[PDB]
Amino acid sequence: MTSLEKARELLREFPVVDGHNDLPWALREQVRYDLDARDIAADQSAHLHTDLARLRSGGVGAQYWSVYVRSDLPGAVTATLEQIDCVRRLIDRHPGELRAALTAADMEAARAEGRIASLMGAEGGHSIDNSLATLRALYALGVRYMTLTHNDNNAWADSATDEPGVGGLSAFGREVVREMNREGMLVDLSHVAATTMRDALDTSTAPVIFSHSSSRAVCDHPRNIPDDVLERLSANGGMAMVTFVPKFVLQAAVDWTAEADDNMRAHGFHHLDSSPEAMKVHAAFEERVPRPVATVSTVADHLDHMREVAGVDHLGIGGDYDGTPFTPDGLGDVSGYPNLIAELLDRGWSQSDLAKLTWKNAVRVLDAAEDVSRGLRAARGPSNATIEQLDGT
Numbered sequence: 001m002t003s004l005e006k007a008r009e010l011l012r013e014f015p016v017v018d019g020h021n022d023l024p025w026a027l028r029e030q031v032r033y034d035l036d037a038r039d040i041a042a043d044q045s046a047h048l049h050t051d052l053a054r055l056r057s058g059g060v061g062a063q064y065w066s067v068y069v070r071s072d073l074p075g076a077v078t079a080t081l082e083q084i085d086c087v088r089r090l091i092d093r094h095p096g097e098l099r100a101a102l103t104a105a106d107m108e109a110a111r112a113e114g115r116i117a118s119l120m121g122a123e124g125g126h127s128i129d130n131s132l133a134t135l136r137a138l139y140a141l142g143v144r145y146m147t148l149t150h151n152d153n154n155a156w157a158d159s160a161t162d163e164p165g166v167g168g169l170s171a172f173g174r175e176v177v178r179e180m181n182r183e184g185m186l187v188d189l190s191h192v193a194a195t196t197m198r199d200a201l202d203t204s205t206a207p208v209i210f211s212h213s214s215s216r217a218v219c220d221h222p223r224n225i226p227d228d229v230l231e232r233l234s235a236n237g238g239m240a241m242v243t244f245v246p247k248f249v250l251q252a253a254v255d256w257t258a259e260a261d262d263n264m265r266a267h268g269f270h271h272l273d274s275s276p277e278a279m280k281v282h283a284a285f286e287e288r289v290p291r292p293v294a295t296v297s298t299v300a301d302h303l304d305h306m307r308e309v310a311g312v313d314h315l316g317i318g319g320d321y322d323g324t325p326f327t328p329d330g331l332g333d334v335s336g337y338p339n340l341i342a343e344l345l346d347r348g349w350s351q352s353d354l355a356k357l358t359w360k361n362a363v364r365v366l367d368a369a370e371d372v373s374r375g376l377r378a379a380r381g382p383s384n385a386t387i388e389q390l391d392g393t
């Protein structure tokens, strides 16, 4: 059979656990959670990267649904609860296809019955409003990882896409990591500064993840992971879930985006300005310089290097579907994973290597978080510390 046929067979046995899909935010923004208007039991290819049929075609067996909210708007906690509610509603609406999962055991139970294990990951520490009790409440509601920052610093952690702030994690930031360890919530180091990555690795007694990050050695961008950090994963026990975002994974796209941003500033606009006037400037840039397009090969290049440095036991996949506007050719939506698996087969990845990449590493890591949590919950009570106490006024 072809490598694509083989890939599909392999995925039927050990499907993809995808680390980060932003369907909930997409539903919030497109239809304000009017789920009938974007029914994922129907074909949503006109509007979304994700629906149930495409998930199954793509060999997705578990999904961390992102409950991302904006850090630059007030009411982050309320919005996070709305995102969590969206995931809950999706699970309730589609019991034939989805199963809520809170534990590694739930993930295996879902796989045994042929349902997609549905987990939740918060994207940015702003979702807890500097409150450890709020962190505990998110865990109680089913959140199983939290990205420590999004694109901006918060009070206790530095983002890779902001200026240096506290220098990595503050004292309270370390306390957040300790509490995540006690609860059993995975520390997600996507988005965070390299300083923050190192501080989190120093502090965490549980395996950490990167829910959607690729390789900085392959493509120098702050959203990607440095080799020195990848090297620490085997000791930590964690895993880096490669992402598909073209402006992170393809050198030409990184360069293009930098030039686009410079061009915006040259016209007196902030690079993130979305006004009609700014859009005109950007359109003119894209007219003289077409947007470069990544491929499955681009993503495989990252995985090859990440495997060499981190080890095959410390890799996963985090597509960022419905969280980013552009995709590599062959990975245009959630049905695309078999194309990546086929490319890796062609590059000599073994069946057991690939079962680790798709399924086994993610289950091991969540089980490890649970194991560490058992020890810490037995050893001490929850923290009552405040950011004022630890970081000062």
Ligand SMILES: N[C@@H](Cc1ccccc1)P(=O)(O)C[C@H](CC(=O)O)C(=O)O
Residues within 6 Å of the ligand: 022, 025, 068, 123, 212, 223, 245, 320, 323, 324, 325
């Ligand atoms: N939650 C998404 C941001 C978002 C998307 C839509 C409306 C608001 C916020 P993201 O963080 O998952 C995507 C981003 C790449 C990009 O911007 O393309 C990255 O991961 O670094």
Ligand SMILES: [Zn+2]
Residues within 6 Å of the ligand: 123, 190, 191, 212, 323
């Ligand atoms: Zn992100």
Ligand SMILES: [Zn+2]
Residues within 6 Å of the ligand: 020, 021, 022, 066, 068, 123, 323
């Ligand atoms: Zn996201």
